[PDB]
Amino acid sequence: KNRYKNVQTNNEYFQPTDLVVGKDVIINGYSFRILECDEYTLKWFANNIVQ
Amino acid sequence: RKDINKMYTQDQYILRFEGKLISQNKEDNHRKFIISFFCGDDTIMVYETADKNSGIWGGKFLERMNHNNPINNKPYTELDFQIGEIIQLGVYRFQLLRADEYTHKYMKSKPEVFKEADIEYTLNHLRKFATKYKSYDEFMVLLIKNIDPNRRGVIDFNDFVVGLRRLGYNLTYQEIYTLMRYFDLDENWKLDVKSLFVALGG
Amino acid sequence: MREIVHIQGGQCGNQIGAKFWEVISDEHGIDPTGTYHGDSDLQLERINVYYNEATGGRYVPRAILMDLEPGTMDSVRAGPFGQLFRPDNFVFGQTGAGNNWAKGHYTEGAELIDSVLDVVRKEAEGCDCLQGFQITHSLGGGTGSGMGTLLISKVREEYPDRIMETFSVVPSPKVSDTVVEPYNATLSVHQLVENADECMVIDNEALYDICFRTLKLTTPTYGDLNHLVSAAMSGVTCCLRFPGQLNSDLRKLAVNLIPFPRLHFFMIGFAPLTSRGSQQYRALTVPELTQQMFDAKNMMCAADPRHGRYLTASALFRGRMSTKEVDEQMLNVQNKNSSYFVEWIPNNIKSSICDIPPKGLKMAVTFVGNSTAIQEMFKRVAEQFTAMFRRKAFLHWYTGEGMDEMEFTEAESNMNDLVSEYQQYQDATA
Amino acid sequence: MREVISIHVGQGGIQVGNACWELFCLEHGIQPDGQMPSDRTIGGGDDAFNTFFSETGAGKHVPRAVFLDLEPTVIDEVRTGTYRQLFHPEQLISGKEDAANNFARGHYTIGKEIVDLCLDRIRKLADNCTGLQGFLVFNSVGGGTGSGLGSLLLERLSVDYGKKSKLGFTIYPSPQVSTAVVEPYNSILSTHSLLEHTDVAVMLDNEAIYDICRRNLDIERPTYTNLNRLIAQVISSLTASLRFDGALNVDITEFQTNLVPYPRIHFMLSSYAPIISAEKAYHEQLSVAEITNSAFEPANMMAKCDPRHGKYMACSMMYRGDVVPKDVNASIATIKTKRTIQFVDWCPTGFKVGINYQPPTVVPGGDLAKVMRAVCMISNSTAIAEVFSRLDHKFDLMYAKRAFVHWYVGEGMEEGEFSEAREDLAALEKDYEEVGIET
Amino acid sequence: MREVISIHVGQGGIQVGNACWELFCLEHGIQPDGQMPSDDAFNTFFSETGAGKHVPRAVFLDLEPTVIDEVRTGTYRQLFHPEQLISGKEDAANNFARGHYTIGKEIVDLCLDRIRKLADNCTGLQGFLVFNSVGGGTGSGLGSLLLERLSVDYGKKSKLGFTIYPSPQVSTAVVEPYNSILSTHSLLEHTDVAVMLDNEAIYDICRRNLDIERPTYTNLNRLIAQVISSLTASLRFDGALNVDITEFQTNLVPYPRIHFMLSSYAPIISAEKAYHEQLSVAEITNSAFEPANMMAKCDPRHGKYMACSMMYRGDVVPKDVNASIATIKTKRTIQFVDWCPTGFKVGINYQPPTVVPGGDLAKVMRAVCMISNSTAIAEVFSRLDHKFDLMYAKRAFVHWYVGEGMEEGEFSEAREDLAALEKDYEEVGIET
Amino acid sequence: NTTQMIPTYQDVKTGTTWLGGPTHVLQEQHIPGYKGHVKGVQAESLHGKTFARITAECLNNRYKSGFIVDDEERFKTNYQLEYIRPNLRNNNNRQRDDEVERLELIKAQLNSQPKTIEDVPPIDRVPVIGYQGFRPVYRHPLKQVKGPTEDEIDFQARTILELTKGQKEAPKEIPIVGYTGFQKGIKAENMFGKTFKDLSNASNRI
């Protein structure tokens, strides 16, 4: 549990919008792919990110 | 007083030549020599090479010193040390056959002193002689016919010099070498007449 | 060639090892995936000292992480550069020592050491020309102080000629966090003196002193403390990994620093250290490097050297600098402060030069000094120990696990004898 | 037809040897890769490189040198440098474990497993030569392997070849500024070994060269590399007469026949002049008269010993450049007349003079400027008795309390070797006062 | 007009003969299929078909199919004659009894069939070359049977065996001391010249000269092939001093029982450092006489020399050869037996040593092959006898031999023969 | 930095200054003994390169500064920084380009005659007479040969001509014999019998 730099965006800290399902992401020199998300987040995403 | 400034700025330049001795004796009509010229203080060293299984005691022939030409009573300079010349060191006369590659670069790198070593001067020298002939075009055909008897295209040094002497044009041995070496495409010392014709005019 | 394998035990040891391997990996340009990404050839010149090669072109450190509880390793493994460690090298118990020396030295450590002794022997046997071993642990906890020392005793029997290094974190009196500090610390030193070739003393109180006043940090963490220690530890073996004007390996330091076999307790200090605000106002020249070398507040121990006299001193410079300035300053300091230097051994300072500075720096300093002012550590530990032992406090736990109270006595006397003779050379004159 | 073999041991030996060979390659025109240039197509002239180099039959040359050490870090840097193609691959002998400033380790424990390889290598170099003049050795005496293997090699070389000449260039520890702490032991123990096994020895103390560079060359932050170029210059003027023609030739054998009055007394200290920087080199004439005055100037001594405190036994100096023999004789007459410089009573004549024609060469990226005249001098004096006195003072201090003795006893050297080493130094000293007294 | 026949028996024999014949083919310029690329001298080793390909004068013997199989599927399948590659079905299984009394008896007839057919074509047969590894079953037993049959079947013809003995401490099998002694006893009175090429020495030679730290069997066989070529180049290339096969046993064999000798070759230098030295004839002989450079694991410094045989090839000069001999004689650490004042035989050939492309060795204009006979050879026999005595004392591994026709008391007479050989070697080395 | 760029080739030939040189016309110095600030002496701890050259360094602003060193210039030792040949007086080996193309010539030549597409003689289409083996009955008797295709042979030939006097370079340049470095995976992948000089190439080529 720590704050990690994101190479994909000007060596900035991660933001909740960065983690997008279906698209790959980079953490600490490792490459991950997001397959699915908990639908609790899906409710959170629909209520706060829609602007 | 001794010229320190010349010693400082021209100590590194050393001219190395290969030569053969011209003398009455048939004893030494074959053995080769290497001649070194230190231009720092106009000092000349002559080395005598020895072949294996020859029986001759090779080694240093003349140690380095400074000595002048007997005819004009003037010290030798780098201008007089041009390839093809005969240099008389005391009672020994040497004929300069071939020069070191670094030496050839040195003479070519410094113009307005070694005039015979500059190509455009040699071409201008040869071309300027066409004034006595009637026309420029007939000068070319006369030259190629005289130089090349069977028009083979590539000639030797001996054929090249004998043709020029037959025409009656007085080229020093240095300029003849300069033109010969330049027009050698694959470096086997055979003149390319076709490029010579183009260089003169096409 | 001269490679060394890393041995580290206990949670105090593990947290130090985690930061140290990160520093070396960054120094040699090793990514968290274990693949080289450097630019200069010299970074791969002497990498065999610490890194082993596997198929696929990846590097793995030759470190052994050892403990009595699996909680610490499950935390250190997930950290940055934590995937480098080979999972086989991890060895842990299922019970723990509970800050009790006897549990970690007689009951659990004895049966557990069979496994960990197998893996370390495999590591030592693989390398063609072993140089030595280095240790990192703390003397305040039973698992670190008990099974760590019993490891030292066994390994010394199998490699009596190989060099051995130990970093000890002795408990400072002011910031003390356990009640059983004097018992296990006193007993561990008794075994430590007989077997360890070299000992470095590190006090967390001193580290707290340095960070608050030199770097001027409001809220440091153990990571910052671990960062300072790793910088010095890399400095000792740095010139063993890089070419320089004057080479100096581990063996050279030992012979040139300890005049007598039973005096191998040191104190270390790292320079230069500067706060971010004052980082742009200083000038990195030899006089500033050597003036902070010997300054009292920069030592990694709570022992002030001006209460005693230096026996011998050593210094390791990193970077490109003129040799004359290096030697000139050593003679300069050794003259203006003749009261702090023992007289019967002239020229008691050693110097070395390494051409590769640490990353982000131009010139560096690593100082290791043997001074008679560190006896106050054992003097104060002795008085708490005799305060504990006179009333037989917390003793039924220790005596209830196969040992009697007698072993407490000679360890007290042997440590007591150590202080007396170590103090003898302070007033000795020729 | 005359060859000399150079021996280098220790880190100081390798670094000194490295600076010497770049001078030799540039002096004879050798490129780093071995061919002279790729430009000169004549060759076959003025064979003088045979003294230091050896032809392979067609093309490159290989130096007649050997590199010996016990830690590979310094040697490995040579193999990855720009001179990787010059030396033969298997004459740069490297060990596995460093001596670690321990004389015993480098004399009885580790050196035995590596001394065999060198003698096999040396035998193969000597068989190639036909007119081998002698061996040169370079060693930093303050280091463990430098004095360790150096002691072992000289003892073995004494019986393998016998009367063959061996020349020594030691680098003694400085009186007050030193690298290590245990240097008095391994330095003193070295003297006993080399006293009866070397023919000529020269002191090359570091701080003396520090003074020269600061005062003359005007360098405020010198390093060992600047120093090694001066000693390399000394070697050049020392053996120049072997391969260069001059008015008077002085060979290697002319030193152990002119400079040591007695077999026990073969320790000497050298000087070099002029040493001047390019910006102020051209502001004075550098006359041969004044350059020989600078050599006898004790402030330019290359060892931290003042000859004014003792007498002179013999003085050998070599000139190179465009010197005139009558000018040389004129300056020598003034030196004898000078009252502050005195000679020993039983030496009415004490000068050996050599003249060479080749001026010293200038190395690009160097420090000295190029001059038409230079002199290198080797002097034997009773003033060399003081350095052993201060070493005896320091050695006795920490041997009274038997400090560091466990670092030597446990490696096979018995205790009694310190006692005999001390007595020989005392006997060696007593010789120096005995000789220095007048009749 | 001169011919020599090569015999390769046992896996070591085939794997060394492959390198030998590849080297010969490259040296003589034949294509792998056997057809000359349109270019007399090669008649010593080959045989013309009248017009077309050439047939090597070799026969391959083995009792196990796979090793011979690679010969018939490699690049040289079309070279050799199809029925000169004789292979059996079942192996000796390291049992000297099996390869000398049970299964090797029924193949020697066809071996001699092929030998007779090859020799009948030959008109000036000089001698036979035999290759075999001693530490093996059919290498020893079948070899012993073949030599015993060939001695009576050909009379006084010279036979040379380039055997391979087990190394002193590095070994592969566990019963190889047993079959080495019986094979040595069998060959002692049946071979004329024997050369020892134990494997451990070649490993050190490779590691020290060719700068190979992880060698394989391909490297070792190339050196042996080079040795064979240097030894037999005088039969097919002109030179200043030519020597035949017959003028070896008249020079290096002081007594009939003493015909065991060891070889050395120089130079062997990798191309990385081959051009750093001129390879003078004066120094190549020093490398040849270096005790560490011996191709057999024996120390010549521990005993007296009997005779030395020298082969120089390249562009050597007779004067330069003799100066090196004089220098070696003046040297003190090398001493000869008392009753041998003159102890050298010298050979000079003009053909330079050939280089295999893509190989290990560099190309040199000079080389020397040294064959010496010395009293130091007793050490290997002594250690072999000690190893056997440790084993045979309580009769280990004896049922695997006695059950195949081997008599129980056969080991005792072999031990007696070895003791007699040791006695002879010690009595020769004493001064009169 | 002044030691290698000053007396340039243009100035040394037909110029005022020789190798030693009173190079004060060309740039600025401070005639040894001088009291004053130089802006680069005490700050950078410049070593060697006597005072005349030190001032020329600071005056002409080649220079360096800062606590942080940008990797590349950080990783230089004193040995190769100073002993970089002779540079400026007058204006290396060609090897390791010939060695690689000799190696490739053997490989290309070896691949040149693999008997592609029924160019084998009538013999050798079937194996040798006494072959042992298996010889499956339900298989085509005559062997099948594929062989390399034409462009692959031409692919190798292009590089051979290209490498000789072309754009491609010598691979890496390597140490000689006893260099005790890592050598980049000689032990990880066995590579046992490949002639350490040659072994260096294969491991370093990757």
Ligand SMILES: Nc1nc2c(ncn2[C@@H]2O[C@H](COP(=O)(O)OP(=O)(O)OP(=O)(O)O)[C@@H](O)[C@H]2O)c(=O)[nH]1
């Ligand atoms: N003049 C001079 N002295 C040197 C040089 N290098 C080392 N030394 C001297 O050598 C002494 C220490 O020994 P080193 O040369 O560094 O190493 P070593 O001789 O191999 O001995 P060990 O370190 O034990 O292996 C120092 O006190 C220096 O005085 C050098 O380049 N020039």
Ligand SMILES: Nc1nc2c(ncn2[C@@H]2O[C@H](COP(=O)(O)OP(=O)(O)OP(=O)(O)O)[C@@H](O)[C@H]2O)c(=O)[nH]1
């Ligand atoms: N020099 C060399 N010796 C070899 C080689 N292959 C096997 N050997 C030796 O041969 C001995 C064992 O015999 P093998 O070659 O395996 O075969 P063999 O002699 O016919 O014995 P069997 O296997 O029982 O039939 C081993 O001890 C090796 O020393 C090789 O390629 N080169």
Ligand SMILES: Nc1nc2c(ncn2[C@@H]2O[C@H](COP(=O)(O)OP(=O)(O)O)[C@@H](O)[C@H]2O)c(=O)[nH]1
């Ligand atoms: N420098 C440093 N010291 C630590 C760290 N963690 C613990 N310590 C010290 O270790 C001592 C207690 O160690 P302990 O938990 O008993 O280790 P254990 O023996 O493995 O149980 C305390 O006095 C702390 O000062 C750390 O991360 N860094």
Ligand SMILES: [Mg+2]
């Ligand atoms: Mg050293």
Ligand SMILES: [Mg+2]
């Ligand atoms: Mg077999």
